[PDB]
Every structure is written in structure tokens, then in C-alpha cells.
């Protein structure tokens, strides 16, 4: 089967910003890595899949944004959509 990527080092960096004194067990980190791999593959899936069904040559932030609101429930989407636009607003500027 398919190989998952390892996001542990980046999950750990995020943990230190939200809980600097708190560690994480190996098994708990493995669960986080599977969550991150699962959401990456789901959002990236519909963005590639919206660009090919809407006759678009390029995957942009607006396929990610649409996919995020297709898959994420309620306030998670709005906040994720908030955080996504602010990131490209530092990036483009």
C-alpha cells in the first residue's frame, strides 16, 4: 500500500507554541500524524478534483477554500478559512 508522510516534527512545533511545557507520547504523536495525513489527503483531493471538473488549469487558494468549506463542519471551516486567507495575505505581501 501507500506511504504516509511524517508531520511529527511540525506537529511538535505547533504543540510548543500552544502548550510550551507539555510533551506528547509516541502513540499520541502517531495518532496526530494520521489525523494530519488524513486531512491533507482529503482537502488536497477535492482541490485537485474541483480544478479538473471546473475546467481550470491551476490549483489556487480558491479551490482549497472551497474544499475546506465542503469538508470541514461549521465553525471549524470559518476559522480555517480565516486562517487560510491571512496566510496568503502575509505571503503575497
Amino acid at each position: 500500500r501507500s506511504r504516509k508522510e511524517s508531520y511529527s516534527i511540525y506537529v511538535y512545533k505547533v504543540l510548543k507554541q500552544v502548550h510550551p511545557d507539555t510533551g506528547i507520547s509516541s502513540k499520541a504523536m502517531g495518532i496526530m500524524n494520521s489525523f494530519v495525513n488524513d486531512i491533507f489527503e482529503r482537502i488536497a483531493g477535492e482541490a485537485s478534483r474541483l480544478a479538473h471538473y471546473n475546467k481550470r488549469s491551476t490549483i489556487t487558494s480558491r479551490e482549497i477554500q472551497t474544499a475546506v468549506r465542503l469538508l470541514l463542519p461549521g465553525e471549524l471551516a470559518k476559522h480555517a478559512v480565516s486562517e487560510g486567507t491571512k496566510a496568503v495575505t502575509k505571503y503575497t505581501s
Binding site: 505547533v14 507554541q17 500552544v18 479551490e63 487560510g84 496566510a87 496568503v88 505571503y91
Partner: protein, 83 residues
């Protein structure tokens, strides 16, 4: 790096390659992987924030699987996104 310039811990370059894997003929704008990296960093921060609170509430200094469960199973939106 492109990830610092977006204010992110998650690697933008890796998300770019992940997006290109879905269709090697589909091109990837610069905004797409930055936006997606920030979305996953937010979701990661949200789970760890709540799981870290569960660890602290139980007088623990590290997150264990039970803390992830307590955090997600008691959050309707996370439990229904992650299962």
C-alpha cells in the same frame, strides 16, 4: 523558506508537492499550498490546545491518547470531522 513568510510552522514546500501529486499535469499556484498549510496548522493547533488542556486538568505534563480522545470526543465538530 516560504513557510516563514506565511507565518506557518507547517512546511509549504511539502504541501506544494502533495498538491502536485494529485495530478502531475495540474499546476499549483503559490497561494494554494500556503492556504492549505495554514488550514492544517490551525486544525493541529486546535486539537493540541484541547488535548493539552485535558492533560493539564488531569495533572499530567504530556499528552497521551486518552487526552486526544477526551478532547475530540467532547468537541462535536472535531469528533464529526475526525470520527
Amino acid at each position: 523558506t516560504r513557510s516563514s513568510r506565511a507565518g506557518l510552522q507547517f512546511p509549504v514546500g511539502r504541501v506544494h508537492r502533495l498538491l502536485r501529486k494529485g495530478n502531475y499535469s495540474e499546476r499549483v499556484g503559490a497561494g494554494a499550498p500556503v492556504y492549505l498549510a495554514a488550514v492544517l496548522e490551525y486544525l493541529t493547533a486546535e486539537i493540541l490546545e484541547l488535548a493539552g488542556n485535558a492533560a493539564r486538568d488531569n495533572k499530567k505534563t504530556r499528552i497521551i491518547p486518552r487526552h486526544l480522545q477526551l478532547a475530540i470526543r467532547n468537541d462535536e465538530e472535531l469528533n464529526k470531522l475526525l470520527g
